[PDB]
Amino acid sequence: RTELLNVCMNAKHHKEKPGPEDKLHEQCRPWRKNACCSTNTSQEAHKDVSYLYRFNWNHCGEMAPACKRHFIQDTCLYECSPNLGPWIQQVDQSWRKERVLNVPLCKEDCEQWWEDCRTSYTCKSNWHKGWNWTSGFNKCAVGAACQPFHFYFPTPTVLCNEIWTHSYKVSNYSRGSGRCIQMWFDPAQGNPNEEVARFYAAAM
Numbered sequence: 135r136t137e138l139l140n141v142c143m144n145a146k147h148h149k150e151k152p153g154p155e156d157k158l159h160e161q162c163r164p165w166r167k168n169a170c171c172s173t174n175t176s177q178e179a180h181k182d183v184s185y186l187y188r189f190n191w192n193h194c195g196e197m198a199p200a201c202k203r204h205f206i207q208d209t210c211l212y213e214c215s216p217n218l219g220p221w222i223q224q225v226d227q228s229w230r231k232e233r234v235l236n237v238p239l240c241k242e243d244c245e246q247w248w249e250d251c252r253t254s255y256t257c258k259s260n261w262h263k264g265w266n267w268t269s270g271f272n273k274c275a276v277g278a279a280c281q282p283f284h285f286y287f288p289t290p291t292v293l294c295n296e297i298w299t300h301s302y303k304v305s306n307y308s309r310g311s312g313r314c315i316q317m318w319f320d321p322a323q324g325n326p327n328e329e330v331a332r333f334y335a336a337a338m
């Protein structure tokens with residue numbers, strides 16, 4: 135555990151520095167200029183490990199567009215943020231890229247994600263493991279009943295903390311405090327997570 139600021143973990147589980155965003159992640163607009171989902175300077179083998187065109191958000195029927203928007207933000211933060219270094223667990227190489235633990239997600243990001251997913255459906259509370267991937271995309275395992283989102287995630291805390299097995303630990307702090315990570319931002323007005331990484335690098 136060395137470099138914590140402006141750093142990435144790639145799909146081969148080596149640390150790397152960020153760079154200009156790649157074409158696959160074009161919709162991840164906040165990270166266009168400085169991203170861990172970056173172009174490569176060498177002829178590294180091309181294999182997309184992104185969830186953007188891989189994960190089946192509609193495993194229990196149509197996910198409401200408002201819910202999907204949060205999942206896009208979530209995916210973009212995980213795949214592109216160069217400000218998660220303080221939470222990277224380097225011994226764990228079992229995720230598609232970095233394993234992060236207890237990232238202090240801003241209160242608003244979590245509560246509104248939970249609200250906006252009220253009318254969507256899912257079949258499990260931990261989305262990292264346990265899917266049936268034989269069709270190429272993930273489907274619910276046999277016996278895993280589709281239910282309203284709040285059946286499996288009864289509070290915002292349960293959603294944000296459990297969905298990716300403690301990747302997030304929702305904060306009591308809110309946006310603008312410099313003490314929590316937000317899932318999206320306007321880049322022309324500045325990346326607020328840079329300050330947040332600095333704060334926790336000094337504490338962790």
Ligand SMILES: *[C@@H]1O[C@H](CO)[C@@H](O)[C@H](O)[C@H]1NC(C)=O
Pocket residue numbers: 144145146173174178179180181182183
């Ligand atoms: C660049 O290399 C990385 C690391 O292997 C890989 O994940 C990515 O798919 C490559 N980029 C392209 C252009 O596919």
Ligand SMILES: *[C@@H]1O[C@H](CO)[C@@H](O)[C@H](O)[C@H]1NC(C)=O
Pocket residue numbers: 266267268269274275276
């Ligand atoms: C996975 O899905 C396929 C059908 O696409 C099915 O044959 C198989 O039994 C499923 N396995 C589980 C564990 O649900």
Ligand SMILES: *[C@@H]1O[C@H](CO)[C@@H](O)[C@H](O)[C@H]1NC(C)=O
Pocket residue numbers: 306307308
């Ligand atoms: C959250 O809890 C921490 C630790 O107890 C405390 O320092 C801080 O004042 C709290 N922040 C808010 C916004 O409640």
Ligand SMILES: [Ca+2]
Pocket residue numbers: 215216217325327328
């Ligand atoms: Ca960021």
